[model samples]
Target chain A: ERMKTSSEHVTPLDFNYPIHIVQAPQNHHVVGILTPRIQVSDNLKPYIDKFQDALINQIQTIFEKRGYQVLRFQDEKALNAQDKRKIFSVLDLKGWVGILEDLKMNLKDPNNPNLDTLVDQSSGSVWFNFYEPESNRVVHDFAVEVGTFQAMTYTYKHNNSGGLNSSNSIIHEYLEKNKEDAIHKILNRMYAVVMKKAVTELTKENIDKYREAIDRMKGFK
Target chain B: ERMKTSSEHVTPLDFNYPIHIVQAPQNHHVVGILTPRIQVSDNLKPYIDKFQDALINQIQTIFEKRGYQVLRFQDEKALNAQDKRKIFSVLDLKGWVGILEDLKMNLKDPNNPNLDTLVDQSSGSVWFNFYEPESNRVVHDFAVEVGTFQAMTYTYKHNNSGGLNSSNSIIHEYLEKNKEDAIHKILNRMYAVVMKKAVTELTKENIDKYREAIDRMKGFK
Candidate 1:
């Protein structure tokens, strides 16, 4: 008996938007960094120092090995996880992953600078607590977490920390309808950080001091 | 302008072989299953217990309103974070999600007598955890801990898990490629499982009991 199957770019979820847009890292290596949950006993100062030191050291070692550079900073260290929420709200994981994949596909073209290879190579070298899966997609179990009751707490109360990802089909419905709209929405939002007055005082030169990873990616090393 | 795209089922890092298959529970009471971490955590037991109890309570309240019998079970507890690589040995997060989705689909199917809907007025419910997003094929930030990583870890560590998935895919592909030999292989395997000791030894009376949350579904409530 013959069985039927298809490999199409069909949207599994019936969403309103043309493309489900999630923001991705604009400048590669500009990965948003966050400290993992620490043992509950520590105070804010030592905790911040420890997390920064450890993260910097770890990132440095990994990126340095691949001939890249990275950096970290914070002016207001007194803020708790709640304050971080507003900051995180701007960093959407789904948007980020979508942009990256779109970029990867675009970069894979011969005329492009081979962005996919860069991503693959960078991923191969980077070492973190997170496991590097064989593929980019978050497997089903990961998607399950988002919908669970506890996840709602994190989403509603906790700050946004990680890069954007499109881990669930339902989320796409929340974003724009199709891919093109998603791309535009993400790019515009990212660029909005520049246009918004909140970020105006900080110029690229001032920001350059903070973007060690971006500098390194651009052959700063 | 129309763009040219490849028709490959681009395997992500997590897409691998014989997946961990789970059949959704057919019972009517709320299911109270612990995550592996909760089951094994000695210090975290308090938190774990609260977590499990909370899930059960929440499901009972919500699901009862919808008119369904909720089945509950304690976890079959993995010995380690990776289940000693036993129960979770599948290919990727997608594979685990696939199993969960299959279980959900199967549990709701009218044909499956043992696991069909018990209540006449029950609204369908399935629940799981939050997970991270990864690639184009499988992307989305799960708000809860969807347990994809745990399953992936199990799949990687489990000894007997790998070969079946690729083998099945080969059969899937063979059927796609118009190969007759593929059909024979599938039939032979089916016979081995159904006619041989596989089904007989796994009798209904001696079957293992497990519980699943009706709230695993996204946006259920």
Candidate 2:
């Protein structure tokens, strides 16, 4: 009516989720990695795709190497109208990170205060939730947090030297200095390393906990 | 709408900003401290207001001690349409920090990723800008950017402990435990320190740059 203050994109339910897991039966084989399901039409869409793909590929490959099939939580598929509305409505009801950030970066003309020299620090656990829809249809509310590391400490800021003071600053310098083509190369390699660290909790035994669900789910009848 | 996407409160233009600083020749005795200018109906409104007022009084006294009159940049006032629209439009146009943070906060329910083990760090200077409207009509775009310190560092995070790990967690704990009402006491005192540090940068000498534009201009023609 009044120029909808919000817009919608990316269908979490359109791609037939593991209904069986939520219904009468449970499926442990399909571990649906609840990766960042961003819009294909999103800003930095390709970079978003790259990271999401990296997350899926890493987890799936890890599981596959251990003799299991993994599924990309975000994929395109079909769903019946009845199930679709229930799923989409439930999903449309929730939202989270990076969306507004996307808005800020894109709409940063008058917005986005360029703060002066100030170093801010923060820390928290490195985690991914166990997305077992059967227990509690968490929609995107994968509240069962699990992590390999006790914590991760990160810092991002500009210094008077014009260089960033960060743990990964050296790698950052090298990547930037190495030129344009080198970014993806390093990003790909780094993502591999990062994912390895990210899912350290997902052990062969732990894999049984958060199985690969979406990638392998061809479709639901 | 299913739920409220935004909130309201506070009038920016409603306050009497120094129009003379804009119109006639100006007074460099006054300096406006634009904190990451947050919201009035903000979640952190009480705390932020305490800080704002504390800083205002701080600079006012700081200036007076140096034989200079100081005014709170954000105090209430009465103004005509010509000045209101002409002057008010500038500040509102360039919305900055802490505003959206108010949004993204609880607003983060759906999207905030509930970042696990996220050690977010940032730091920089702590300088209150010299509100010299006569210089360049910079509005909130006070691009001159000078400062007390080259920068300052701070951090925050959440973990198993249920307590925050911040640069000043000790001082923070004292306040939270007690608001002096601990939250209120330190809340305002904390800003006094900032204002103290802030004006010291404007120092007594730097005041020659921005002046007492508003405190003196009670009712303009």
Candidate 3:
């Protein structure tokens, strides 16, 4: 029987690859947050730094739990300096930086300290792109925004007649509490849909070749 | 331990729904085929009609085998007449009608009898839209095309002196032999990515609600 073909070797189906998570800049305080005029005491830099680490850790933990060998640069500093700069500029250009600047400008109006602006906006975006480091191929790039008080309208009260009382504190506190969950949602979507599609493409291509082999085998018979 | 204060009931995670498969018109012979000139030796209506039934059945069988309850209108004739008419017209307009007319015109030119025009073009399209009968919502709409002799380019040889011989015969014969596989590929993709996303949306929504419940439970504690 000519049915038995030589070298019937088929490709293996196991797909194990390293995934790199490159964190982009996080959004800062936006409109409706009080400025330094009202004795603003809270510094957001520390919290922002901590939040970035948490975002990376959350994504790493999720992908690792799913059996993927997660890869990372030697330090957050080791991430592509040029790419990091690009993402920062992109996020800045995309509503985040502009809104933050707008919020600061609104706060600086001394005569209008009790600014009755109906523009209380708090948003944080964790932008990241996933890649196969070996091939330096990007699977998908995504920027997910988590907004709070997006529907609320609030006025900047004149220092609230108390020292060091400001909306900035509240905004930062809210983000400190919510950023973890918001970033988790983003990573979850990236993994389930985008990354899964990339992995599936490889397997599907292998399946097609396998089918072709079987079809060829039948032809020999 | 105040966590058990509210009813702990959660919606069940069962996803069971009926899916319908609608068949569109299959491709008929295109350019360089005798459309009544060479005695029109073959009437493809019977074959084309048979192919549509086979396409629907093929998809139904695959989905049902995977435990999805296959659905259909009580009278397939009850399918949306407008939609049915629209798809058939679309398939016709896309490549079928124009190519066939082109085929016939080339055949009419006596000087081009042995035109050597290399006009072998074969195309088949399977179009379908999914709807939830209960909700009357379209999940997704898709149209897929399969081309034959795409790998080979050839000239239109005049009807062979042997009579009833032309590239049209080859195109139709190739389609008849391979349409099942081509349509199966289309349906397989529909199920894998498109329908799977639809199913996942429901499951993911449920999961979100479940997580919210658990979070609320923790808050109560």
Candidate 4:
């Protein structure tokens, strides 16, 4: 229950002393897509909402308690724009592609629907952003951090649990005695699937050079 | 609660029964070469030993409570040769590389290390080995799954502070907060990076598919 750090007035002592909170960079929102579920489960449905809630709150608290800001969003009706950015409707595609072709001009152009860079290289992928910043004393600049991804992955998988061996059955059977283990296996399996390939590509030569960037890409920095 | 599913041999008439007991996959043990420090401040070290102690215990518990074993060995000296698979030896390049080659042989002959495919590619960097079926299921399996190239990146960064920062004041300071953040940051960054490369590479028609073992590389499944 002890205070983690001493309140030694590291900044100003005034009540109105505005702590210049820097935006966690523009790239804080982590972009991701969720298409119509191919195989949905009743048990898994509630879990996606629960896991996403736990993850966001846990991460938000980690920063907000320390007086830092965290931002996030989820759009239900989504479509992939021509420029590879995600839009809420097919109606938003033209403006979305216009925004992607010219980011700086689009930002000022107002009418341009801002398209996200973090999308599937192919056209029509959903996108979102994550921001973790140095102002919060973090090196990376986004929500693409470990906890966030773990949360999203679980949210995605638990909802889409209809595959070989019956994922829902396997999870339900495992969850009884091993609640936490079952949770980890389900989530981490998704996490593992999420990272296995990219990490594998990071051979010895490139691992060190882009080490800092690579770390950020994983959203842990 | 009520018995949701029934097995052939035993029936659960009461709440407390072996019916609650379930099996988990086998795991392996992976040791990061560096012995991380214990910092001395709330701002820097977060919860210090408590956070780290709790973190490891929670992970171990998740593995063991379900009958999966996890053995934590502090520092490299306690690491057994037989248990050695994926090691994060930061400074000891020669020693790290040597171990990889040896494991390749064992994996090819003995209890399924899956070394040729895993460790060979991980040469000159963090070593990886698939923990084959063993007497200790959880320990061996977790070791293989978590010890993959991506997970070790955090294991190494978490073990070390990476480098000193404004937050880096003392040992306890580093341990409590800096280390905590480092672990979070490292894992997040890794997810972003590894996932990106994976998606991009897997789709490339000319790329070598030998290393691409994971399914649903980025949660598509």
Q: Give TM per candidate.
A: 0.19, 0.30, 0.21, 0.18
Which candidate, 2 or 4, has the higher DockQ? 2
Two-way lDDT contest, 1 vs 4, winner: 4
lDDT of 3 at A90: 12
Model 1 / residue B76 / CA error / Å:
4.1
**What are the DockQ scores of the candidates, in order?**
0.01, 0.04, 0.01, 0.01
Q: Which ranking of candidates, highest DockQ first?
A: 2, 4, 1, 3
**Candidate 3 — which residues are off by over 4 angstroms?**
A1-221, B1-44, B74-116, B147-221
Q: Give the alpha carbon lDDT tens digit for every residue of A1-221 in model 3.
A: 00111122322222223444333233221111001000000222323333334334544443444333444444333446443322211110011100111111123346654332222122232223332221112223333333222111222342433222354222433333233332333223322332333333322232122233222323312
Q: For model 1, what is the error of residue A197's alpha carbon versus the real structure, in angstroms, after optimal superposition?
A: 22
The C-alpha stretches of model 4 lying farther than 4 A from their native spots are A1-221, B1-42, B82-221
Q: How are the candidates ranked when ordered by TM-score, highest leading?
A: 2, 3, 1, 4
Please give, for residues B29-133, the per-residue lDDT of candidate 1 as tens digits.
222223322121122232334433433454333333333343332332323333322121111101011111001111222453222110000001112221111
lDDT accuracy of residue B60 in candidate 2? 48
User: Where is the poorest 10-residue window by lDDT in model 2 chain A?
Assistant: A99-108
User: Model 1, residue A193: what's the lDDT?
Assistant: 30
lDDT of 4 by residue, A1-221 (tens): 00111112222111111222233433222222222111112223434444434334433433343333333433222322321222111100000000000000101123422211110000011111211121111121111112111111111111222222222122233223233323333344333322332233222332132245424434434
Can you give the lDDT of residue B101 in candidate 1?
A: 9
Give the least accurate 10-residue stretch of model 4 chain A, judged by summed lDDT.
A91-100
Off by over 4 Å in 2: A1-28, A35-46, A74-127, A137-196, A209-221, B1-28, B32-221
Compose the digit string of candidate 3's lDDT tens values, residues B1-221: 00011112322212223444333233221111001100000122323333334344544443433333444433323446443322211100011100110111122345654432212222222223332221112222333332222111223343333122444333433333233332333223322432333333322232122233222323322
Residue-level lDDT for A79 in candidate 2: 29
